[PDB]
CSV table of N, CA and C in Angstrom, one decimal:
chain,number,residue,atom,x,y,z
A,166,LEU,N,111.6,106.1,150.1
A,166,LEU,CA,111.3,104.9,149.7
A,166,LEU,C,111.6,105.0,148.2
A,167,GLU,N,111.3,105.8,147.7
A,167,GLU,CA,111.9,106.0,145.9
A,167,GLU,C,113.5,106.1,146.1
A,168,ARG,N,113.9,106.7,147.0
A,168,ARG,CA,115.6,106.8,147.0
A,168,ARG,C,115.9,106.2,147.9
A,169,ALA,N,115.4,105.4,148.7
A,169,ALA,CA,115.9,104.1,148.9
A,169,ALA,C,116.3,103.0,148.2
A,170,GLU,N,114.8,102.8,147.8
A,170,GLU,CA,114.9,102.1,146.5
A,170,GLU,C,116.0,102.5,145.6
A,171,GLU,N,115.9,103.6,145.2
A,171,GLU,CA,116.8,104.0,144.2
A,171,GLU,C,118.5,103.4,144.6
A,172,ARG,N,118.7,103.5,145.7
A,172,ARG,CA,120.2,103.3,146.6
A,172,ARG,C,119.9,101.5,145.9
A,173,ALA,N,118.9,101.2,146.7
A,173,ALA,CA,119.1,99.5,146.3
A,173,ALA,C,119.5,99.2,145.0
A,174,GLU,N,119.0,100.3,143.9
A,174,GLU,CA,118.9,99.8,142.7
A,174,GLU,C,120.1,100.4,141.9
A,175,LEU,N,121.0,101.7,142.5
A,175,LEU,CA,122.5,102.1,142.1
A,175,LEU,C,123.2,101.2,142.8
A,176,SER,N,122.7,100.6,144.0
A,176,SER,CA,123.6,99.7,144.8
A,176,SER,C,123.3,98.5,144.0
A,177,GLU,N,122.3,98.1,143.4
A,177,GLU,CA,122.1,96.8,142.9
A,177,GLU,C,123.0,96.7,141.3
A,178,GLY,N,123.0,97.8,141.0
A,178,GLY,CA,123.5,98.7,139.6
A,178,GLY,C,125.0,98.2,140.0
A,179,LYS,N,125.3,98.7,140.7
A,179,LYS,CA,127.2,98.6,140.6
A,179,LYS,C,127.3,97.0,141.6
A,180,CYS,N,126.3,96.4,142.1
A,180,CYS,CA,126.7,95.1,142.5
A,180,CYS,C,126.6,94.5,141.3
A,181,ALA,N,125.8,94.6,140.2
A,181,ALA,CA,126.2,94.0,139.4
A,181,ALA,C,127.7,94.4,138.5
A,182,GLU,N,127.7,95.9,138.4
A,182,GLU,CA,128.7,95.7,137.8
A,182,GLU,C,130.2,95.0,138.4
A,183,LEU,N,129.9,95.2,139.7
A,183,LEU,CA,131.3,94.8,140.5
A,183,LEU,C,131.0,92.9,140.5
A,184,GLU,N,130.0,92.4,140.2
A,184,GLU,CA,129.8,90.5,140.3
A,184,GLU,C,130.3,90.7,138.9
A,185,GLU,N,130.4,91.3,137.7
A,185,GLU,CA,130.6,91.2,136.5
A,185,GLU,C,132.3,91.6,135.8
A,186,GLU,N,132.6,92.3,137.3
A,186,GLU,CA,133.7,92.9,137.6
A,186,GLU,C,134.8,91.4,138.0
A,187,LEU,N,133.7,91.1,138.9
A,187,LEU,CA,134.2,89.8,139.8
A,187,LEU,C,134.9,88.8,138.6
A,188,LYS,N,133.9,88.5,138.5
A,188,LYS,CA,134.0,87.2,137.6
A,188,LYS,C,135.1,87.7,136.5
A,189,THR,N,135.1,89.1,135.8
A,189,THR,CA,135.7,88.9,134.7
A,189,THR,C,137.3,89.1,135.6
A,190,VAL,N,137.3,90.0,136.4
A,190,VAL,CA,138.9,89.7,136.7
A,190,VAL,C,138.8,88.6,137.3
A,191,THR,N,138.3,88.0,137.9
A,191,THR,CA,138.5,86.6,138.8
A,191,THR,C,139.0,85.6,137.0
A,192,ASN,N,138.1,85.7,136.4
A,192,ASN,CA,138.1,85.2,134.9
A,192,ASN,C,139.7,85.0,134.5
A,193,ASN,N,139.8,86.2,134.7
A,193,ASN,CA,140.9,87.1,134.0
A,193,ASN,C,142.2,86.4,134.8
A,194,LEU,N,142.4,86.7,136.4
A,194,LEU,CA,143.2,86.3,137.2
A,194,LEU,C,142.9,84.6,136.7
A,195,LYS,N,142.0,83.6,136.8
A,195,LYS,CA,141.9,82.6,136.4
A,195,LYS,C,142.9,82.3,134.9
A,196,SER,N,142.7,83.3,133.9
A,196,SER,CA,143.2,83.2,132.7
A,196,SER,C,144.9,83.2,133.0
A,197,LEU,N,145.2,84.2,134.3
A,197,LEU,CA,146.8,84.5,134.1
A,197,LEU,C,147.1,83.7,135.2
A,198,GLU,N,146.3,82.5,135.7
A,198,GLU,CA,146.7,81.5,136.5
A,198,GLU,C,147.4,80.8,135.9
A,199,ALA,N,146.5,80.2,135.0
A,199,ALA,CA,147.0,79.1,133.7
A,199,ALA,C,147.6,79.8,132.7
A,200,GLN,N,148.0,81.3,132.5
A,200,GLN,CA,149.0,82.1,131.8
A,200,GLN,C,150.4,82.0,132.8
A,201,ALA,N,150.1,82.5,133.8
A,201,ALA,CA,151.5,81.9,134.5
A,201,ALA,C,151.9,81.2,135.0
A,202,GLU,N,151.1,79.9,134.7
A,202,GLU,CA,152.0,78.7,134.4
A,202,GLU,C,151.9,78.3,133.4
A,203,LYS,N,151.9,78.9,132.1
A,203,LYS,CA,152.1,78.8,131.1
A,203,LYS,C,153.6,79.3,130.9
A,204,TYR,N,153.6,80.6,131.1
A,204,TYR,CA,154.3,81.2,130.8
A,204,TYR,C,156.0,80.6,132.0
A,205,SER,N,155.6,80.3,133.0
A,205,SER,CA,156.5,79.0,134.2
A,205,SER,C,157.0,78.0,133.3
A,206,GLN,N,155.9,77.6,132.6
A,206,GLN,CA,156.4,76.5,131.9
A,206,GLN,C,157.1,76.9,130.4
A,207,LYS,N,157.0,77.9,130.2
A,207,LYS,CA,157.7,78.5,129.3
A,207,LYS,C,159.2,78.5,129.9
A,208,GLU,N,159.1,79.5,131.0
A,208,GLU,CA,160.5,79.0,131.7
A,208,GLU,C,161.4,77.5,131.3
A,209,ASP,N,160.6,76.9,131.7
A,209,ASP,CA,161.3,75.2,132.1
A,209,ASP,C,161.5,75.1,130.7
A,210,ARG,N,160.5,75.4,129.6
A,210,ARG,CA,160.5,74.9,128.4
A,210,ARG,C,161.7,75.6,127.7
A,211,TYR,N,162.0,76.6,127.6
A,211,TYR,CA,162.6,77.6,127.2
A,211,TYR,C,164.4,76.9,128.6
A,212,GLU,N,164.5,76.7,129.6
A,212,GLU,CA,165.2,76.5,129.9
A,212,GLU,C,165.6,74.7,129.5
A,213,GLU,N,164.3,74.2,128.9
A,213,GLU,CA,165.1,72.8,128.3
A,213,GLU,C,165.7,73.4,127.0
A,214,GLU,N,164.9,74.7,126.2
A,214,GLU,CA,165.5,74.7,124.6
A,214,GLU,C,167.1,75.4,125.1
A,215,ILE,N,166.9,76.1,126.0
A,215,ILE,CA,168.5,76.2,126.5
A,215,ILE,C,169.3,75.0,127.0
A,216,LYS,N,169.4,74.4,127.8
A,216,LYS,CA,169.8,73.0,128.1
A,216,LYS,C,170.2,72.6,127.0
A,217,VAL,N,169.3,72.3,125.6
A,217,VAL,CA,169.6,71.7,124.4
A,217,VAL,C,170.7,71.8,123.8
A,218,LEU,N,170.2,73.7,123.5
A,218,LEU,CA,171.3,74.1,122.6
A,218,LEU,C,172.6,74.4,123.4
A,219,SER,N,172.5,74.4,125.1
A,219,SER,CA,173.4,74.2,125.8
A,219,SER,C,174.8,73.4,125.3
A,220,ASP,N,173.7,72.2,125.8
A,220,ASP,CA,174.9,70.8,125.1
A,220,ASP,C,174.7,71.0,124.1
B,166,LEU,N,110.1,101.3,153.0
B,166,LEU,CA,111.3,102.2,152.9
B,166,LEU,C,111.9,101.7,154.4
B,167,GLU,N,111.5,100.6,155.2
B,167,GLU,CA,112.6,100.2,156.0
B,167,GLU,C,113.5,99.3,155.3
B,168,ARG,N,112.7,98.3,154.2
B,168,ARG,CA,112.8,97.0,153.4
B,168,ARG,C,113.9,97.7,152.4
B,169,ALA,N,113.3,98.9,151.6
B,169,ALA,CA,114.0,99.4,151.1
B,169,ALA,C,115.7,100.1,151.7
B,170,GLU,N,116.1,100.5,152.6
B,170,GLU,CA,116.9,101.2,153.2
B,170,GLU,C,117.9,99.9,153.3
B,171,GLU,N,117.5,98.3,153.8
B,171,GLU,CA,118.2,97.4,154.5
B,171,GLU,C,118.5,97.1,153.2
B,172,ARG,N,117.6,96.6,151.9
B,172,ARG,CA,118.2,96.8,150.4
B,172,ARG,C,119.0,97.4,150.3
B,173,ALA,N,119.0,98.6,150.2
B,173,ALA,CA,120.2,99.6,149.9
B,173,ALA,C,121.2,99.4,150.7
B,174,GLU,N,121.0,98.5,151.9
B,174,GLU,CA,122.4,97.9,153.0
B,174,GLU,C,122.8,96.9,152.6
B,175,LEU,N,121.4,96.5,152.1
B,175,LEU,CA,121.7,94.4,151.9
B,175,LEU,C,122.7,94.6,150.5
B,176,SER,N,122.8,95.7,149.5
B,176,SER,CA,123.1,95.7,148.3
B,176,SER,C,124.3,96.7,148.7
B,177,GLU,N,124.8,97.0,149.4
B,177,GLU,CA,126.0,98.1,149.8
B,177,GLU,C,126.7,97.2,150.2
B,178,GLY,N,126.2,96.5,151.1
B,178,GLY,CA,126.8,95.2,151.8
B,178,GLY,C,127.4,94.4,150.6
B,179,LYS,N,126.7,93.8,149.6
B,179,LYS,CA,127.1,93.0,148.6
B,179,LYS,C,128.0,93.8,147.9
B,180,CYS,N,127.7,94.9,147.7
B,180,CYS,CA,128.7,95.6,146.7
B,180,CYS,C,130.1,95.7,147.5
B,181,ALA,N,130.3,96.5,149.1
B,181,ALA,CA,131.6,96.1,149.5
B,181,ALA,C,132.0,94.4,149.9
B,182,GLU,N,130.9,93.4,149.5
B,182,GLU,CA,131.8,92.5,150.1
B,182,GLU,C,132.5,92.0,148.5
B,183,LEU,N,131.9,92.5,147.3
B,183,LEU,CA,132.1,92.1,146.0
B,183,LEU,C,133.4,93.4,145.9
B,184,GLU,N,133.5,94.6,146.5
B,184,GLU,CA,134.4,95.0,146.5
B,184,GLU,C,135.9,94.5,147.1
B,185,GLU,N,135.2,94.3,148.4
B,185,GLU,CA,136.6,93.4,148.6
B,185,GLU,C,136.5,92.0,148.2
B,186,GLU,N,136.0,91.4,147.7
B,186,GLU,CA,136.7,90.2,146.9
B,186,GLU,C,136.8,90.4,145.5
B,187,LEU,N,136.9,91.5,145.1
B,187,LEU,CA,137.1,92.1,143.7
B,187,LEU,C,138.2,92.5,144.3
B,188,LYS,N,138.5,93.5,145.1
B,188,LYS,CA,139.9,93.9,145.5
B,188,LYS,C,141.2,92.5,145.5
B,189,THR,N,140.3,91.6,146.3
B,189,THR,CA,140.8,90.6,146.6
B,189,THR,C,141.5,89.7,145.2
B,190,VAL,N,140.4,89.5,144.5
B,190,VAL,CA,140.9,88.8,142.9
B,190,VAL,C,141.8,89.6,142.3
B,191,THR,N,141.9,91.0,141.9
B,191,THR,CA,142.1,92.3,141.7
B,191,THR,C,143.6,92.1,142.0
B,192,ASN,N,143.8,92.4,143.1
B,192,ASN,CA,144.7,92.0,143.8
B,192,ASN,C,145.8,91.2,143.7
B,193,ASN,N,144.8,89.6,143.8
B,193,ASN,CA,145.5,88.9,143.8
B,193,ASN,C,146.1,88.3,142.1
B,194,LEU,N,145.3,88.9,140.8
B,194,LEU,CA,145.1,89.1,139.6
B,194,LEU,C,146.8,89.9,139.8
B,195,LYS,N,146.8,90.8,140.0
B,195,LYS,CA,148.0,91.8,140.1
B,195,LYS,C,149.1,90.7,140.4
B,196,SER,N,148.9,89.9,141.2
B,196,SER,CA,150.3,89.1,141.8
B,196,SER,C,150.1,88.5,140.5
B,197,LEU,N,149.1,87.4,139.9
B,197,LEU,CA,148.9,86.2,138.8
B,197,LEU,C,149.6,87.4,137.7
B,198,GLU,N,149.2,88.7,137.8
B,198,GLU,CA,150.0,89.2,136.3
B,198,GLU,C,150.6,90.0,136.5
B,199,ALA,N,151.5,90.2,137.4
B,199,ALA,CA,153.1,90.3,138.0
B,199,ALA,C,153.8,89.0,137.8
B,200,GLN,N,153.2,87.6,138.7
B,200,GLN,CA,153.8,86.7,138.4
B,200,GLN,C,154.1,86.4,137.0
B,201,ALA,N,152.9,86.7,135.9
B,201,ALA,CA,152.8,86.2,134.5
B,201,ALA,C,153.5,87.4,133.7
B,202,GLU,N,153.6,88.8,134.6
B,202,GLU,CA,155.0,89.5,133.7
B,202,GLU,C,156.0,89.1,134.1
B,203,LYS,N,156.8,88.7,135.6
B,203,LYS,CA,158.0,88.1,135.6
B,203,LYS,C,158.0,86.5,135.3
B,204,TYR,N,157.3,86.1,135.0
B,204,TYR,CA,157.2,85.0,134.0
B,204,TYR,C,157.6,85.3,132.7
B,205,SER,N,156.9,86.4,132.2
B,205,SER,CA,157.0,86.9,130.7
B,205,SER,C,158.3,87.5,130.8
B,206,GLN,N,158.9,88.0,131.8
B,206,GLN,CA,160.2,88.8,131.5
B,206,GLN,C,161.3,87.9,132.0
B,207,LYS,N,161.1,86.8,132.7
B,207,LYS,CA,161.8,85.5,132.5
B,207,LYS,C,162.1,84.5,131.3
B,208,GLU,N,161.0,84.6,131.0
B,208,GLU,CA,160.6,84.1,129.3
B,208,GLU,C,161.2,84.7,128.9
B,209,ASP,N,161.3,85.8,128.7
B,209,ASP,CA,161.9,87.0,127.6
B,209,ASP,C,163.1,86.6,127.6
B,210,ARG,N,163.6,86.8,129.3
B,210,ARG,CA,165.4,86.5,129.5
B,210,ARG,C,165.8,84.9,128.9
B,211,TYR,N,164.8,84.2,129.3
B,211,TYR,CA,165.5,83.0,128.9
B,211,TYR,C,165.0,83.0,127.0
B,212,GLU,N,164.6,83.6,126.5
B,212,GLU,CA,164.2,83.6,124.9
B,212,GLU,C,165.8,84.2,125.0
B,213,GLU,N,165.7,85.4,125.1
B,213,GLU,CA,167.2,85.8,124.9
B,213,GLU,C,168.0,85.0,125.5
B,214,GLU,N,168.2,84.2,126.1
B,214,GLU,CA,169.3,82.9,126.7
B,214,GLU,C,169.1,82.3,125.5
B,215,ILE,N,167.9,82.1,125.0
B,215,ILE,CA,167.9,81.1,123.7
B,215,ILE,C,168.9,81.5,122.7
B,216,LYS,N,168.4,82.8,122.6
B,216,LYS,CA,168.8,83.6,121.8
B,216,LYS,C,170.7,83.5,121.6
B,217,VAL,N,170.9,83.8,123.1
B,217,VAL,CA,172.1,83.7,123.3
B,217,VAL,C,172.7,82.5,123.1
B,218,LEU,N,172.3,81.3,123.5
B,218,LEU,CA,172.9,79.9,122.8
B,218,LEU,C,172.4,79.3,121.6
B,219,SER,N,171.3,80.5,121.3
B,219,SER,CA,171.2,79.5,119.7
B,219,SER,C,172.3,80.9,118.9
B,220,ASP,N,172.6,82.3,119.3
B,220,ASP,CA,173.7,82.6,118.4
B,220,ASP,C,175.2,81.9,118.8
């Protein structure tokens, strides 16, 4: 029981780490969804600056 | 004990679910990170293009 609970606790420990990582990574993903979009926007804003400078 | 083992399995189960969800967001993060990277690479190419056009 103690080891089964220990496993539940170790698994809970890992779970919490994974949960924290899931949120951290998901939140970093969201940051990167937004950043990938901001960089995409920079690609377009830059294309417009290129177009402006091109004109 | 049966419950503790069950909890070890449920928490391990959840860990595995989180590992798959974490890998899913981590891999999707790699995709978004890579997209951010690609968008940043293109952004830099465009900045470089701005520099070319600016020059």
